[PDB]
Structure 1
Amino acid sequence: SMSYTWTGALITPCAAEESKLPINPLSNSLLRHHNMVYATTSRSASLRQKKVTFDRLQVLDDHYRDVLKEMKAKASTVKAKLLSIEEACKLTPPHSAKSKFGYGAKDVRNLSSRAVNHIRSVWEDLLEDTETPIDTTIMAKSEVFCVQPGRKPARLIVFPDLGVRVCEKMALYDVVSTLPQAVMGSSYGFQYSPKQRVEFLVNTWKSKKCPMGFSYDTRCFDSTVTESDIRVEESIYQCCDLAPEARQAIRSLTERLYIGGPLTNSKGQNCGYRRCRASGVLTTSCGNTLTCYLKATAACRAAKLQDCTMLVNGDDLVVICESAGTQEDAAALRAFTEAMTRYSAPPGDPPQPEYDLELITSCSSNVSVAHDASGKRVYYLTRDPTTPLARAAWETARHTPINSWLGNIIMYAPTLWARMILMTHFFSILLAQEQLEKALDCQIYGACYSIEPLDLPQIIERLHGLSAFTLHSYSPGEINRVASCLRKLGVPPLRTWRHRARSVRAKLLSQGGRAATCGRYLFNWAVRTKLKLTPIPAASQLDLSGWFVAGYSGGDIYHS
């Protein structure tokens, strides 16, 4: 079937869409070349649509079915709790899209009788109507990036009403939170923190006689998801012990929402139909991981690859296996791609076999190596800093809802670039404006979290470990990448930053409390006359488990 059908109606913006970085004093400090940073707008909607509209090709075989059973077996062990309207309401973000029925996120969290009575009807409806397609909205996602030697057309997000969204939580939250792990096990990426992802990646890499690995970029994964897939996915969920209403709920959401449905724009006009994955639903991340894993696993067997270990995060896939030689591997990978193509998951960038782990890129990042105070190697997780910086600049000169810099600092706290640039910049700013003690919302694996800036040192140590404050001697590969990015964007050089940080540090010492703590641990690198860094008392009082349990991108989740 066609992934998308269009009536001709336009994908419209429900306000004003900014596209260029403002020339501001605070931002021009971080990076000068503002004319290299852009935000996607609905103006490029049509272009995306062309790229994401086509006819799927899907042929299944024994390997696929054999793997689907292996997976269903493990799912059977699961028992998923049915959330109550009240619990589901807790999970709704405060910034979540308002309903088309007289209420928004705020009311939902407050349990407003109106918001709640409506949610009930939507539920009662799901249990009664097992066929009527459910409406969804189609918008142009606004994201910021850096120009490439054209530009990236905005991504399109499809999502149902807030009422429907709260019900999805009731029936499938516990499911999409425990099942993917019970099925894929150590291969489920969202269960790991940055430290753990690295551990798993080098531990897997070193467990092979002669390792070979590759990342696999599926071309617009969401559009390749077929009605067949969405149902196979449902069969897996159906293996869970479920409460009657939940089972009926899943059956209906599958047919009415997940496999497809009408598309309405912000103006109420009909846009077309969707016969693929809905990026903005609760089951997106879970289902994409399950589908990707299923196919890739089956593809490995079809391709005769040896001892394949998968690490899947949604549609993001990386594979480490036993090398059979340069020619044998290149032939096998090629077969793998063909098998994946028949499973309706064609490549965008033909997969290239890598023999140097640091060269493999999964979830837009890679495993690199640095050294602790003792000079002992300390493997860690990094990534090109171009996008994080473009967004950083952007977020500085524009009030953004989800500060992605806070998050980027947490996730990449031990990297060269996050420590030298991000930590420095944002703090001297927070301090200058005296915002050191303000809770800010940021994201981690799709879920929205409220974070207090000064609690960073604990968080960092608890997630990464003290070594994150003393790492040095980053590989030459890493340096050259941070070098080019900074050059390209017109970012101040190392010497400039050290001086700035050299100042922010002392700026922080003279205040004590958690503040002086930050200056002491975060900017240790700054001074040559260091300071022995010991375990932070408050580090052991942080329950960051919920932070790394499952994926929720587009799932509209908010962990209180």
Structure 2
Amino acid sequence: SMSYTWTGALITPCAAEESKLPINALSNSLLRHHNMVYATTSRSAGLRQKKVTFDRLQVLDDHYRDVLKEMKAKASTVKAKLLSVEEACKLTPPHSAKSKFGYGAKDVRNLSSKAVNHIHSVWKDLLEDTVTPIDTTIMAKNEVFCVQPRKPARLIVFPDLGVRVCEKMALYDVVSTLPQVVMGSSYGFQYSPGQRVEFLVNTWKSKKNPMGFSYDTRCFDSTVTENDIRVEESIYQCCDLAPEARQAIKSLTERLYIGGPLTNSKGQNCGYRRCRASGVLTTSCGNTLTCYLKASAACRAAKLQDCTMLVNGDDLVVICESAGTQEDAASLRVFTEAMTRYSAPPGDPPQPEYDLELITSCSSNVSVAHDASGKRVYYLTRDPTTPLARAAWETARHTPVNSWLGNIIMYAPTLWARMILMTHFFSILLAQEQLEKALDCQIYGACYSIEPLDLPQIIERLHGLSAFSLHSYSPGEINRVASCLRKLGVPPLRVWRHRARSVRARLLSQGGRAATCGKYLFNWAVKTKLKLTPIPAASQLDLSGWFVAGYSGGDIYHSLSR
């Protein structure tokens, strides 16, 4: 069973692809070593193809079977509804890829009858045909990174817009509700960053003698077997569903999720997929359920005691009771052997850790600092390299999604997000006079439209007021940021402090919400700290739905509403 079989047709770009950062002012003021920053293109697609193509061997045992039975039992308590065409249309991003059938995302959002008529025909086709494979487009992703003495572009596989709308009608409620019921506290997308930290810290504190590790599966999507995908469907079918949803879910599973033909942007047949499609609604939910199923079973095979797991798609973290250093090492090898049997081998062998802060997952790790009172406070951070590389790229070129905005929101408590990202971007928004202009960013795969001026409220709601007063960061954290700045040619933190004092002054000068950004976001920069009290407007924010589920690759849109 090969994850992919290829014809020879090339994976082609849909337009010109920029692979390097252009020299400019605002950007150079952020990062000087612009040659370390690059964007992946279809020119490396061949390298990725070789990586993602391999044979999968699956061997299931009783541990797998027991866990699966328990999961289905919980899934049986879920009732999910079909989404109306109107509801599905409103979930479509304004810039989603247009349909090959004469209409685009705008038409969908506006409920044009041409688009709605086509969507109705696709749905009817799903109910009437549960066999014919559905076409998909395979593209090379254009993502920005920093060299680390270059990685090939990742591939994305997705169905036509019409099909995507139908996936929402049939499964949006399911993938948004089932995971948390089936996996409970182990489902990572139910947590905002602060909630994730609290769960990890308390889980770590609850063990008498804790040991923990992260497990990275080598090219997870490709390790997902056709059987794995049918198992996911069996879990979805456990829910109380309307007859039409059951038929559509079955049809989508057999015609799209389990596999299908691959077509490039030129319309040429590129090959055939028999693994997880990275660009469908069920990608995140499916990956999390499957990763959880295999890992829960592996914990049992390895006899790990008092196991607590945290799963986000293919990202896995396990905290358990230590049985001794030698014993732990041997257990992890057994855990790994089991995962391998289930068709989920490691990219890099997992390593037992005895300090929560040393565990890295979701690119992040827990770190510690102090609030105004001097009391310890845990927060989520990560290596700032990629965030800074993309920050530099976004300052230079116009981009649809602003990773810097997403990063400020997710990593607001960090030293780097506060001193660099906030300072740099608010400086630009000020000059360009675009403070009140809404921008698009992503959170757990979903696209959100947010006004930079709302950041203070958003940050207070998610991280609490302490996010504006953290100080005395850990030595390791400070040294990682400092070293990263030296590496990329980014001005040292001391320079950012001076820049921030100026940005803060200018923001205060404008009063209103802008002054609020100045007072709260940059209180760390001034010697004479202001007293920070709750922001009344914060409560008016509708953050329900922000941290409920993952939608990476799912073509989901929302946009902040007060």
Give TM-score, length-normalised by structure 1. 0.99
Query: Does the CA contact (< 8 Å) of 2:370 and 2:470 recur in 1?
Result: yes
Residue 83 of structure 1, CA deviation:
0.4
1:160 is matched with 159
1:413 is matched with 412
Residue 198 of structure 1, CA deviation:
0.2
Instruction: Determine helix, strand or coil for the equivalent of 1:78.
Output: coil
1:425-504 correspondence runs (5 A): 425-504=424-503
Query: What is the distance in 2 between the residues matched to 1:230 and 1:307?
Result: 29
Q: Deviations over 1:480-529 (max 9, x none)?
A: 11011101000001111111001001011111000000000000011111
Q: Deviations over 1:83-118 (max 9, x none)?
A: 011110010000100000000000000001100000
Query: What is the distance in 2 between the residues matched to 1:494 and 1:100?
Result: 49
Residue 477 of structure 1, CA deviation:
1.0
Q: Deviations over 1:337-384 (max 9, x none)?
A: 000000000000110110011000111100000000110001000000
1:167-186 correspondence runs (5 A): 167-186=166-185
Query: What is the distance in 2 between the residues matched to 1:16 and 1:74?
Result: 48
1:139 is matched with 139
Instruction: Determine helix, strand or coil for the equivalent of 1:556.
Output: coil
Query: Does the CA contact (< 8 Å) of 2:96 and 2:555 recur in 1?
Result: yes
Instruction: Determine helix, strand or coil for the equivalent of 1:484.
Output: helix
Query: What is the distance in 2 between the residues matched to 1:371 and 1:379?
Result: 8
Instruction: Determine helix, strand or coil for the equivalent of 1:96.
Output: coil
1:218 is matched with 217
Query: Does the CA contact (< 8 Å) of 2:3 and 2:53 recur in 1?
Result: yes
Residue 394 of structure 1, CA deviation:
0.3
Q: Deviations over 1:218-277 (max 9, x none)?
A: 000000000010001000000001111100001010000000000000000000000000
Query: What is the distance in 1 between the residues matched to 2:244 and 2:388?
Result: 46
Query: What is the distance in 2 between the residues matched to 1:367 and 1:498?
Result: 24
2:195 is matched with 196
Residue 460 of structure 1, CA deviation:
0.4
Instruction: Determine helix, strand or coil for the equivalent of 1:219.
Output: coil
Query: What is the distance in 1 between the residues matched to 2:301 and 2:184?
Result: 22
Query: What is the distance in 2 between the residues matched to 1:512 and 1:167?
Result: 47
Query: What is the distance in 2 between the residues matched to 1:542 and 1:118?
Result: 36
Residue 142 of structure 1, CA deviation:
0.6
1:107 is matched with 107
Residue 548 of structure 1, CA deviation:
0.4
1:300-319 correspondence runs (5 A): 300-319=299-318
Residue 429 of structure 1, CA deviation:
0.5
Query: Does the CA contact (< 8 Å) of 2:507 and 2:518 recur in 1?
Result: yes
Query: What is the distance in 1 between the residues matched to 2:43 and 2:318?
Result: 37
Residue 324 of structure 1, CA deviation:
0.4
Query: What is the distance in 2 between the residues matched to 1:428 and 1:164?
Result: 42
Residue 539 of structure 1, CA deviation:
1.2
Query: What is the distance in 1 between the residues matched to 2:419 and 2:143?
Result: 24
Residue 543 of structure 1, CA deviation:
2.0
Residue 440 of structure 1, CA deviation:
0.6
Sequence identity of aligned pairs in percent? 96
- State whether structure 2 residue 55 is matched by structure 1 residue 39: no
Instruction: Determine helix, strand or coil for the equivalent of 2:213.
Output: strand
Query: What is the distance in 1 between the residues matched to 2:43 and 2:170?
Result: 37
Query: What is the distance in 2 between the residues matched to 1:290 and 1:490?
Result: 41
Which stretch of structure 1 is more off in the superposition, 490-499 or 169-178?
A: 490-499
Residue 541 of structure 1, CA deviation:
1.1
Query: What is the distance in 1 between the residues matched to 2:476 and 2:183?
Result: 32
1:26 is matched with 26
- State whether structure 2 residue 53 is matched by structure 1 residue 68: no
1:91 is matched with 91
Instruction: Determine helix, strand or coil for the equivalent of 1:120.
Output: helix
Residue 308 of structure 1, CA deviation:
1.0
Query: What is the distance in 2 between the residues matched to 1:507 and 1:87?
Result: 43
**Unpaired segments ≥5 residues, structure 2:** none
Instruction: Determine helix, strand or coil for the equivalent of 2:476.
Output: helix
Instruction: Determine helix, strand or coil for the equivalent of 1:347.
Output: coil
Query: What is the distance in 1 between the residues matched to 2:363 and 2:73?
Result: 32
Q: Deviations over 1:387-431 (max 9, x none)?
A: 000000001101100111011000000100000000000001100
Query: Does the CA contact (< 8 Å) of 2:261 and 2:272 recur in 1?
Result: yes
Q: Deviations over 1:149-189 (max 9, x none)?
A: 1x110000000000000000000000000000000001000
Q: Give the aligned length.
A: 558
2:229 is matched with 230
Query: What is the distance in 2 between the residues matched to 1:190 and 1:495?
Result: 36
Residue 545 of structure 1, CA deviation:
1.9
**Unpaired segments ≥5 residues, structure 1:** none
Query: What is the distance in 2 between the residues matched to 1:329 and 1:159?
Result: 41
Query: Does the CA contact (< 8 Å) of 2:170 and 2:248 recur in 1?
Result: yes
Instruction: Determine helix, strand or coil for the equivalent of 2:367.
Output: strand
1:342-421 correspondence runs (5 A): 342-421=341-420
Query: What is the distance in 1 between the residues matched to 2:39 and 2:117?
Result: 39
Residue 537 of structure 1, CA deviation:
1.1
Residue 77 of structure 1, CA deviation:
0.3
Query: What is the distance in 2 between the residues matched to 1:88 and 1:381?
Result: 33
Query: What is the distance in 2 between the residues matched to 1:433 and 1:233?
Result: 49
Query: Does the CA contact (< 8 Å) of 2:482 and 2:493 recur in 1?
Result: no
Instruction: Determine helix, strand or coil for the equivalent of 2:232.
Output: helix
List structure 1 segments (4+ residues) > 2 angstroms apart after TM superposition: none
Query: What is the distance in 2 between the residues matched to 1:85 and 1:126?
Result: 15
Instruction: Determine helix, strand or coil for the equivalent of 1:419.
Output: helix
Residue 542 of structure 1, CA deviation:
1.4
Q: Deviations over 1:116-154 (max 9, x none)?
A: 0000000000000010000000000110000011x1100
Query: Does the CA contact (< 8 Å) of 2:48 and 2:152 recur in 1?
Result: yes
Query: What is the distance in 2 between the residues matched to 1:83 and 1:509?
Result: 46
Structural RMSD (CA): 0.5
Query: What is the distance in 1 between the residues matched to 2:476 and 2:307?
Result: 27
Query: What is the distance in 1 between the residues matched to 2:486 and 2:304?
Result: 41
2:246 is matched with 247
Residue 206 of structure 1, CA deviation:
0.5
Query: Does the CA contact (< 8 Å) of 2:75 and 2:238 recur in 1?
Result: yes
Instruction: Determine helix, strand or coil for the equivalent of 1:448.
Output: strand
Residue 57 of structure 1, CA deviation:
1.1
Instruction: Determine helix, strand or coil for the equivalent of 2:156.
Output: strand
